[PDB]
Design an enzyme around this catalytic site. Structure first.
Site, PDB file in Angstrom:
ATOM      1  N   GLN A 107      73.124  77.562  63.520  1.00 41.33           N
ATOM      2  CA  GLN A 107      72.590  76.260  63.466  1.00 41.33           C
ATOM      3  C   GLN A 107      71.218  76.864  63.337  1.00 41.33           C
ATOM      4  O   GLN A 107      70.784  77.569  63.625  1.00 41.33           O
ATOM      5  CB  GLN A 107      72.517  75.443  64.609  1.00 41.33           C
ATOM      6  CG  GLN A 107      71.214  74.712  64.414  1.00 41.33           C
ATOM      7  CD  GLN A 107      72.065  73.156  63.808  1.00 41.33           C
ATOM      8  OE1 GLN A 107      72.920  72.884  64.115  1.00 41.33           O
ATOM      9  NE2 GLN A 107      70.760  72.448  63.006  1.00 41.33           N
ATOM     10  N   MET A 129      65.277  70.261  56.900  1.00 41.86           N
ATOM     11  CA  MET A 129      65.768  70.939  57.624  1.00 41.86           C
ATOM     12  C   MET A 129      67.447  71.524  56.649  1.00 41.86           C
ATOM     13  O   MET A 129      68.291  70.999  57.110  1.00 41.86           O
ATOM     14  CB  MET A 129      66.579  70.238  58.304  1.00 41.86           C
ATOM     15  CG  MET A 129      65.674  69.643  59.460  1.00 41.86           C
ATOM     16  SD  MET A 129      64.788  71.234  60.643  1.00 41.86           S
ATOM     17  CE  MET A 129      66.622  71.644  61.582  1.00 41.86           C
ATOM     18  N   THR A 153      71.494  71.484  56.663  1.00 43.66           N
ATOM     19  CA  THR A 153      71.402  72.863  58.023  1.00 43.66           C
ATOM     20  C   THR A 153      73.213  73.074  56.603  1.00 43.66           C
ATOM     21  O   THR A 153      74.174  72.394  56.950  1.00 43.66           O
ATOM     22  CB  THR A 153      71.484  73.025  59.315  1.00 43.66           C
ATOM     23  OG1 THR A 153      70.088  72.398  59.905  1.00 43.66           O
ATOM     24  CG2 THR A 153      72.485  74.060  59.746  1.00 43.66           C
ATOM     25  N   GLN A 154      72.833  74.347  56.221  1.00 42.93           N
ATOM     26  CA  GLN A 154      73.813  74.921  56.467  1.00 42.93           C
ATOM     27  C   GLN A 154      74.410  76.671  57.124  1.00 42.93           C
ATOM     28  O   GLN A 154      73.344  77.120  57.982  1.00 42.93           O
ATOM     29  CB  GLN A 154      74.015  74.989  54.560  1.00 42.93           C
ATOM     30  CG  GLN A 154      73.593  74.818  54.129  1.00 42.93           C
ATOM     31  CD  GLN A 154      72.251  75.058  53.831  1.00 42.93           C
ATOM     32  OE1 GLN A 154      71.522  75.880  55.102  1.00 42.93           O
ATOM     33  NE2 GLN A 154      70.853  74.880  52.362  1.00 42.93           N
TER      34      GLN A 154
END
Ligand SMILES: *[C@@](C)(CO)[C@](*)(O)[C@H](Cc1ccccc1)NC(=O)[C@H](Cc1ccc(OC)cc1)NC(=O)[C@@H](C)NC(=O)CN1CCOCC1
Ligand SMILES: [Mg+2]
Lengths: 211, 222, 231, 240, 233, 195, 235, 244
Positions: free
Chosen positions: B1, E107, E1-2
């Site tokens: 994450q 993000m 997010t990755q």
């Protein structure tokens, strides 16, 4: 924190501590937990300091605009409700605020509890913060409507002291206020360290503590 | 994450004199157990005799300072080149921080300068915008190491006058700029000894009616 | 005539009357003069009052530490356009850590003004602007017309009776361009230039407005007793 | 969306659409408002061109905005419903956010603000309506009577009339109404309101509506017979 | 997010008396698989700047295109595009730094660590770091990933502080960089022998060296090492 | 909040609602009135999550008061209860539902009958002779099942209600600080000041 | 018909010029700035004797340190006043200080040209904005629907403006007292008004650093009117 | 731009009238006459179809009388297409009310809602108003039997008896003459048909040129029944009253 406020024959007393914590670390020894919204309105602060400051100062803007539009001071009931409706907008978003809106208006003295959930309660006596239980103990056993201004100021002061002693997250100093029909009156900053020893000797209380 | 936050370490210290103010901070920038830079300035002159430092997550600190500097610029445009007072700057910064109440600037911010009566002023902020005026404040990594020392050596806490035995306190005499700088250096030297994220260099910005002056001092590089 | 009802209508000869009428508002406006050397650039503006009890309308606006302009025509439109410049100058600083080139600032003003001349509902800007600045390629002076046309010049003037000042600068071209490292002499040439556009009235202390920018000189405006030196 | 600027200035500095809206008010049936010492009375004309009407269900000319405030009007009937609905919503919205009922002055200011908004908003025409707003503020025994008009201006009146032949009944009120001593009782206030309408109405049968508003949310509408008794007494004194 | 997929390892750099040096290997790893062996991770911008990028390669290729488009856009209506109004290292960096911080604030970061190395108009050396968090810092030596842990210590022995920069020559600086690249080849499992090196000097301009190899490696001592404790044969 | 009870007798509806308001481990108030008058002959008591309760009740109150003014007419208890149910059924599938359970006690002036409606936060409406929300029913319904008649007087309804509160006070671990009792009948709404 | 934001051949916006004609029809409002304070006075102009004149509110408080008088289509002023009050208090929220009179005036004037095909037409009302701040002291501004604002030592707007402005031209000097300014506003109002000036059909107000913005009582103004009559009869 | 071609449907005349509303009323004055008569024990709706043909399929045809719900019906005068738009909206509004309050919608509330929609088209949007006048016949337990009318202005009023469409001046005079308060449905039926027979522009009033309906408490015990008359039933009532 520990805050309290109560109505009585000669208006309303407002007493708060001044400690601020970031975990077990005491981040501040002296923080103002009262806001002077107007000469006849006060607001206490418990919970997230940022939330308490931002929203109550925003309340003051909105209470000020009320006076300009209507040519008259806002009621304590209406002021408390504007604030509770603000909380209700950010419902479940994680705000932490517990405050008592104290003042004098046409209905006489007024006192309203308001928190982040949107709860809005009218009442004679309230106390918020981690040390409210200690304050209530002293308040409930010594409160009367027939209190003199001098004795009432002491009661609120003594009730914060009780909390500051036992509660680890309450202390620093005591800020006192007295609200009349001519407006609120500041009754100073009182260091708990000095106040404790003074009260112990004069009152004879805190016998278990050595000094 | 993905974690959008980080810790760049560092420590800052603001002290308000009678007619001056200082804002100090170490020049070390770190991630985890690595040093990024031994000299990365952290305290800035923002104009109008105001100095500022946003300690914690450097990316958010640089962004906040950059936005406040911008707020000063537009304050001049919008209000006929009026000087932004230290109290006005403080309230402005509160609104900058609270604009991200639900995705905060991860920084402990301090500003220093002079109030409208010419006296020294320090304002302290938390990451979400609660602020207040103070006389003394250490922020950042070694804040807990330094603050107790300043309570003792600046406000003379727990210090009484000999012979009286606890009856009479040590009187609160004002400190000079030379005396303050000594306490600042000893604070950072002590913090460098016992805190791994503190070291390399110390940069102090001193504010008086004459303007903003800088002073630099080496710290241990281990 | 039949083709001046809105900005979206060409006349049979290919003219845009609403733009021409906006241009007319500039001619009614008070005179302002711009000129530069290789080191400095100077704006001089004749401010106008409503009556003797009134203040003198400000003509010069600061856009950045290195750039600013003077206005002639609708003052509110100048406020909108100067606000846009302030933002663009500021975008260049925050994003690229780069001071905005005066030539590029002109291109941005041209394109903003143009959009108002081709679309229905809106109107052209009713103001002319003289932009001065100092960037990486030295001193600069621009003339903005609300038609969209922006022109880089050594010197110029816009407003009522501006032709007199413009002729003077056209004669003095070879002299004032060489005034390098001497701000006071460059201002003198500007004050002497704007004097050619005066009739009946003369340059008083609260009438005259001057601005300057240069090599080691931030954009600063001079009003009141600060310009008494040049009267 | 339809954005067309309908209310605009003319060379002489007039907004014709707002002025033509006043002509619609001039066409409307007469409405009158008179405040006594301890009450306010709202009188309203009903044009007798429309008979076979069902007076039970026909929209009454006087409308309650809240339990302590009423609103009558002159002009376009359909337009008045929109202002009334907005006013009623605002009255409940005020109670809900401020925990006090609206003052008569506040309610008037809101309705007047709506009317004004429709004089400088795109794609809309002004309300062809002037209103008389009357009532008593919470815990107050001072009578309140306000007037509004299409332009959005509003003001307080000791007595006022609007609608067709309002010029005539205003003439009557100006000479008959004494400020130093206003109608001391309900009777005197109603009598003066009926007298004023009798200058214009035609027949005093079902053409006159009267609504008395007293302090502490005491609002009642007079019946035909009650009004008819006033009409009878007035003319019998006139035969002299 | 990755999550990063195809990745590039350390980018190392340092200042010297007349300019800056920057280096990075030519490997594009796919986890533990050493998949792509001809990847250029140093990208020049004009003749005064080299951007070195580590981390996700697909994001690197995106950034590479942003810089190419930046040069194009700067030339528009700019007669001084190859002179006074040419792109500076400080402009290119601040642009990237703006982009990186904006992306992390949405993000959706560019999963990279970037070092912008170059020389300014006035001859000043430029060397600054930025990563996926928008975190920026500058130092006489800069390195990403493993380079931060292994290269910096070696490069800081040459230039330990600001005052050592004028004393350091291009030959000494290049030697230190090349040695660091060898050390990383010994000890970084996601590294390759082949690498690129770029020098931006205020006098000699931009020198871009390709197809460099780690040489002079010590392996002979391995023959004597037997077992893991008690084994003799 | 916690306990709200309702009982419909011969000629009236009686609602009993606790007085306690708790915040953390402290009882902030012991005289809280958990009810709103929707119209002269319709009363709604409520219980649920903090803040949501009063906001919902006052929102319903405003809507019914708006209807009363617009039509110069009081909606029947059945009509009000259906309106309230729809708002809750609308609410339960919202992004953040209102967690409020209500009892609606009203006297229908047209039919000359008292009516009690129980509605939970999901929008589950039921007309009942007596009702409760939460755990209140677990203790009290056995008494009500036993003692309730439809021809009971208001006084007998109050006596049966006292017995329910006594049982709650004995077997609940929870101190709810007694109840405020209100009666809804043909003459309107009034509060029993001694209980 | 024609665009709302159309330029005339002379280079003026038709609608702005026409709104100025509406302001000429409005009741007179006068402002006089002195070093002891700024005085604002207005003609009430009741259309009928049954209209309670005290409900005519053509002088208005924006903040404790800023007042405002209006002339023209006075209904248009309400949203301008609301914006001004919001701007004034919002700045106090952001900067913990009073807002500059010029900055407040500029904020109001930014609304002016926000019309097109935003609101559908310009405002049909002019404002005299009077106030005090620490930087520039006592100030009087004239805010027009063109978006332009001029600072004035003294200014009259409305139907009797050019006659009053000529009178203010002669009478104003830099050493005027507050009492002198009060009588001067009353004098010029009485001159241009149709009906006879008294405490019921004319209103006074002022802004001082100490007491802030104050609207005058009818009893207080009545004495100033009586003081005016006697001093005019004195020569 | 587009401004050139804008008729401006929502403006006042110098006299203070709404042009389009007035012209819509002029349109409606050429429409077939519709009459409503309210009695103590029910309501009658009678309406005249416009110059029909012999090849028109009458039994499946509906141009005048429409059902809004079981308690409320309307007679139409004006553009039929415009009316159907409004009718479908009114049908939905009645069902919304029933779903919300679990009670049938009061007549006036339905009428006010439709009249408010008509009003909107006269004040904003820049669209032409609906060229429709309605006669609403309905029942509820508050006011009992009710007659209303609405017109393109969005103004509505209550009536004991009323006509819309063509020859309303003549028709209203005839109704005002013969109407009495103690009147019954069977008498009101006769009055409605007699009025149409005298005001009609046609040579003679026949069954194929009429639509007819009644709302009666003449339903088994305390309830209301709507009766849309069939062609044969209209033919019978014409013979009964003595017109054909
Ligand atoms: C007691 C201390 C409870 O812990 C009391 O509620 C005070 C209330 C209060 C109100 C206004 C101003 C100051 C204090 N609360 C705190 O001190 C809180 C405790 C707390 C932490 C975290 C929370 O999550 C939402 C909620 C409450 N502390 C803080 O808010 C703390 C994070 N802020 C500061 O210390 C801010 N100061 C630090 C010193 O520099 C100036 C700003
Ligand atoms: Mg260390």
């Amino acid at each position: 924190t520990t805050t309290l406020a109560f109505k009585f024959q000669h208006g309303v007393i407002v007493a708060v501590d001044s400690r601020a914590t970031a975990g077990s670390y005491i981040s501040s020894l002296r923080m103002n937990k009262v806001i002077e919204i107007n000469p006849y309105l006060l607001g206490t602060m418990s919970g997230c300091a940022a939330d308490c400051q931002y929203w109550e100062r925003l309340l003051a803007k909105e209470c000020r605009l009320y006076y300009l539009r209507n040519g008259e001071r806002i009621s304590v009931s209406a002021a408390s409700k504007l604030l509770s409706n603000m909380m209700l907008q950010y419902r479940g978003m994680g705000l932490s605020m517990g405050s008592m809106i104290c003042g004098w208006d046409k209905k006489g003295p007024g006192l309203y509890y308001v928190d982040d959930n949107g709860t809005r309660l009218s009442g004679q006596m309230f106390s918020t913060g981690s040390g409210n239980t200690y304050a209530y103990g002293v308040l409930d056993s010594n409160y009367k409507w027939d209190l003199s201004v001098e004795d009432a100021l002491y009661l609120g002061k003594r009730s914060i002291l009780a909390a500051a002693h036992r509660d680890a997250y309450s202390g620093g100093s005591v800020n006192l206020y007295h609200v009349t029909e001519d407006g609120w009156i500041y009754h100073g900053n009182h260091d708990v360290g000095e106040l404790f020893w003074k009260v112990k000797e004069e009152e004879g209380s805190f016998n278990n503590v050595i000094g | 994450q993905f974690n959008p936050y980080g810790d760049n370490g560092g420590t800052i210290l603001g002290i308000a004199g009678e007619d001056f103010a200082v804002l100090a901070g170490d020049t070390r920038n770190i991630t985890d157990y690595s040093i990024n830079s031994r000299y990365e300035p952290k305290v800035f002159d923002c104009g109008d005799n105001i100095v500022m430092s946003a300690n914690g997550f450097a990316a958010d600190g640089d962004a906040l300072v950059k936005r406040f500097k911008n707020s000063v610029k537009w304050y001049h445009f919008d209000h006929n080149d009026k000087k932004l007072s230290i109290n006005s700057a403080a309230r402005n910064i509160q609104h900058l921080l609270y604009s991200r109440r639900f995705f905060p600037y991860y920084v402990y911010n301090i500003i220093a300068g002079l109030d409208e009566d010419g006296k020294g002023a320090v304002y302290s902020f938390d990451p979400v915008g609660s602020y207040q005026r103070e006389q003394c404040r250490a922020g950042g990594a070694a804040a807990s190491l330094i603050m107790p020392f300043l309570d003792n050596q600046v406000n003379f806490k727990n210090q009484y006058e000999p012979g009286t035995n606890g009856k009479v306190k040590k009187p609160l005499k004002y400190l000079s700029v030379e005396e303050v700088i000594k306490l600042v250096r000893d604070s950072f030297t002590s913090a460098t000894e016992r805190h791994i994220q503190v070291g390399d260099g110390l940069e102090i910005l001193i504010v008086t009616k004459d303007g903003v002056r800088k002073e630099f001092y080496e710290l241990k590089r281990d | 005539n039949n083709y001046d009802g809105d900005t979206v209508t060409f006349s049979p000869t290919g003219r845009l009357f609403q733009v021409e009428y906006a241009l007319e508002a500039i001619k009614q406006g008070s005179v302002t003069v711009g000129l530069r050397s290789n080191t400095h650039a100077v704006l001089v503006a004749l401010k106008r009052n409503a009556d003797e009890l009134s203040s003198y309308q400000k003509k010069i606006i600061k856009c950045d530490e290195h750039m600013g302009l003077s206005l002639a025509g609708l003052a509110p439109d100048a406020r909108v356009l100067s606000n846009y410049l302030r933002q663009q100058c500021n975008y260049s600083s925050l994003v690229f850590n780069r001071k905005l080139a005066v030539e590029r600032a002109g291109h941005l003003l041209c394109d903003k003004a143009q959009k108002n001349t081709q679309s229905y509902g809106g109107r052209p800007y009713g103001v002319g602007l003289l932009i001065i600045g100092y960037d990486k390629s030295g001193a600069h002076l621009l003339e903005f017309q609300p038609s969209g046309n922006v022109t880089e010049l050594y010197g110029t003037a816009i407003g009522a009776r501006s032709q007199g000042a413009k002729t003077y600068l056209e004669r003095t071209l070879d002299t004032f361009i060489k005034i390098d490292g001497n701000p006071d002499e460059l201002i003198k040439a500007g004050v002497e230039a704007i004097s050619q556009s005066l009739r009946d009235e003369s340059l008083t202390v609260d009438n005259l407005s001057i601005a300057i920018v240069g090599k080691d000189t931030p954009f600063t405006i001079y009003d009141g007793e600060a310009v008494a030196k040049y009267i | 969306g339809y954005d067309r600027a309908l209310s605009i200035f003319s060379p002489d500095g007039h907004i014709f659409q707002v002025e033509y809206a006043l002509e619609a008010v001039k066409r409307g049936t007469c409405a009158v408002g008179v405040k006594g010492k301890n009450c306010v009375v709202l009188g309203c004309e009903r044009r007798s061109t429309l008979k076979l009407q069902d007076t039970r269900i026909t929209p009454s000319k006087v409308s309650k905005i809240d339990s302590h405030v009423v609103l009558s009007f002159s002009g376009l009937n359909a337009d008045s419903r929109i202002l009334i609905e907005k006013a009623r919503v605002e009255a409940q919205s005020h109670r809900l956010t401020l925990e006090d009922p609206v003052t008569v002055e506040y309610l008037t200011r809101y309705v007047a603000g709506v009317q004004q908004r429709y004089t400088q908003s795109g794609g809309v025409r002004p309300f062809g309506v002037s209103t008389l707003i009357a009532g008593f503020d919470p815990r107050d025994d001072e009578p309140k009577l306000y007037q509004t008009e299409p332009s959005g201006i509003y003001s307080s009146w000791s007595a006022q009339t609007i609608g067709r032949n309002s010029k005539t009944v205003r003439e009557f009120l100006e000479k008959n109404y004494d400020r130093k001593e206003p109608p001391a009782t309900v009777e005197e206030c109603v009598k003066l309101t009926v007298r004023s309408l009798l200058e214009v109405v035609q027949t005093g049968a079902k053409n006159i509506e009267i609504t008395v508003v007293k302090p502490d949310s005491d609002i009642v509408a007079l019946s035909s017979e009650e009004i008819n008794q006033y009409v009878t007494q007035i003319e019998q004194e006139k035969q002299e | 997010t990755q999550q990063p997929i195809v990745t590039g390892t350390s980018v190392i750099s340092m200042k010297y008396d007349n300019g800056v040096i920057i280096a990075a290997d030519n490997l594009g790893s796919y986890g533990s698989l050493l998949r792509f062996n001809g990847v250029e991770r140093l990208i020049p911008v004009g003749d005064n700047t080299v951007v070195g990028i580590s981390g996700d390669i697909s994001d690197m290729q995106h950034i590479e295109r942003l810089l190419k488009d930046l040069v194009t856009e700067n030339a528009y209506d700019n007669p001084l595009a190859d002179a006074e109004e040419a792109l500076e290292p400080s402009y290119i960096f601040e642009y990237l730094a703006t982009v990186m911080y904006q992306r992390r604030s949405k993000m959706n970061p560019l999963w990279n660590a970037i070092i912008v190395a170059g020389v300014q108009s006035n001859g000043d050396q430029f060397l600054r770091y930025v990563n996926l968090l928008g975190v920026t810092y500058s130092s006489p030596t800069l390195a990403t990933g493993f380079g931060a842990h292994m290269a910096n210590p070696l490069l800081r022995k040459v230039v330990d502080r600001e005052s050592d920069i004028p004393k350091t020559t291009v030959q000494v600086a290049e030697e230190a960089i090349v040695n660091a690249m060898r050390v990383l080849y010994y000890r970084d499992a996601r590294s390759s022998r082949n690498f690129s090196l770029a020098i931006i000097d205020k006098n000699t301009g931009l020198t871009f060296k390709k197809n460099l190899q780690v040489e002079n490696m010590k392996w002979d001592f391995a023959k004597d090492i037997k077992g893991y404790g008690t084994q003799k044969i | 909040m916690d306990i709200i009870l309702g009982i419909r007798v011969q000629d009236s509806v009686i609602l009993a609602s606790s007085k306690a308001v708790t915040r953390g481990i402290s009882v902030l108030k012991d005289s809280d009135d958990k009810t709103r008058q929707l119209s002269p002959h319709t009363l709604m008591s409520f219980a649920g999550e903090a803040g949501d309760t009063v906001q919902f009740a006052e929102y319903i109150q405003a809507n019914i008061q708006l209807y009363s003014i617009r039509e110069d007419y009081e909606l029947s208890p059945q009509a009000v209860s259906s309106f309230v149910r729809q708002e809750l059924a609308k609410s339960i599938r919202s992004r953040r539902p209102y967690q409020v359970n209500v009892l609606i006690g009203g006297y229908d002036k047209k039919k000359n009958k008292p009516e009690l409606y129980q509605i939970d936060y999901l929008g589950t409406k039921v007309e009942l002779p007596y009702g409760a929300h939460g755990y209140s029913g677990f203790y009290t319904f056995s008494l009500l099942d036993h003692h309730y008649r439809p021809d009971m007087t208001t006084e007998e309804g109050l006596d049966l209600l006292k017995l329910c509160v006594q049982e709650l006070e004995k077997r609940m671990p929870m101190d709810f600080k007694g109840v405020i009792v209100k009666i809804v009948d043909k003459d309107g709404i009034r509060q029993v000041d001694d209980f | 018909d024609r665009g709302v934001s159309t330029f005339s051949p002379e280079g003026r916006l038709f609608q702005v010029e026409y709104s100025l004609e509406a302001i000429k029809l409005g009741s007179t409002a006068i402002g006089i700035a002195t070093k002891e304070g700024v005085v604002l006075g207005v003609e009430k102009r009741a259309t009928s004797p049954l209209l309670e004149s005290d409900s005519i509110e053509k002088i208005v408080e924006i903040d404790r340190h800023i007042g405002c008088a209006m002339s023209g289509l006075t209904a248009d002023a309400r949203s301008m006043i609301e914006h001004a009050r919001t701007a004034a208090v919002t700045h106090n929220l952001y900067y913990d200080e009073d807002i500059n009179v010029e900055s407040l005036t500029q904020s109001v004037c930014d609304l002016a040209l926000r019309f097109g095909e935003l609101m559908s037409r310009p405002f049909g009302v002019a404002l005299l904005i009077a106030g005090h701040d620490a930087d520039d002291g006592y100030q009087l501004f004239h805010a027009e629907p063109s978006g332009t604002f001029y600072r004035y030592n003294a200014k009259a707007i409305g139907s009797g403006s050019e006659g009053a402005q000529a009178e203010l031209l002669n009478e104003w000097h830099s050493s005027l007292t507050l009492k002198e300014a009060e009588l001067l506003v009353l004098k010029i109002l009485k001159q241009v008004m149709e009906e006879k000036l008294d405490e019921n059909n004319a209103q006074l107000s002022c802004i001082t650093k100490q007491d802030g913005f104050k609207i005058y009582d009818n009893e207080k103004t009545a004495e100033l009117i009586k003081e005016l009559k006697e001093k005019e009869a004195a020569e | 731009g587009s401004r050139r071609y804008d008729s401006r449907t929502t403006i006042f005349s110098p006299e203070g009238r709404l042009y389009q509303v007035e012209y819509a009323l002029e349109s409606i004055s050429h429409a077939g006459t519709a009459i409503g008569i309210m009695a103590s024990d029910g309501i009658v709706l009678a309406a005249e179809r416009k110059v029909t043909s012999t090849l028109l399929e009458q039994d499946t045809s509906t141009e005048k009388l429409y059902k809004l719900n079981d308690k409320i019906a309307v007679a139409v005068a004006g553009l039929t297409a415009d009316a159907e738009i409004l009718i479908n909206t009114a049908r939905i509004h009645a069902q919304n009310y029933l779903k919300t309050y679990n009670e049938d919608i009061p007549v006036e509330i339905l009428v006010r809602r439709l009249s408010d929609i008509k009003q909107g088209y006269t004040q904003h949007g820049g669209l032409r108003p609906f060229g429709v006048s309605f006669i609403y016949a309905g029942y509820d337990d508050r006011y009992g039997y009710q007659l209303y009318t609405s017109n393109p202005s969005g103004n509505y009023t209550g009536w004991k008896a009323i006509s819309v469409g063509a020859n309303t001046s003549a028709a209203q005079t005839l109704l005002q003459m013969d109407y009495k308060d103690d009147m019954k449905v069977d008498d009101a039926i006769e009055l409605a048909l007699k009025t149409l027979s005298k005001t009609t522009d046609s040579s003679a009033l026949t069954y194929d040129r009429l639509e007819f309906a009644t709302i009666r408490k003449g339903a088994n015990d305390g309830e209301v029944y709507q009766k849309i008359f069939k062609p044969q039933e209209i033919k019978d009532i014409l013979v009964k009253t003595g017109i054909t």
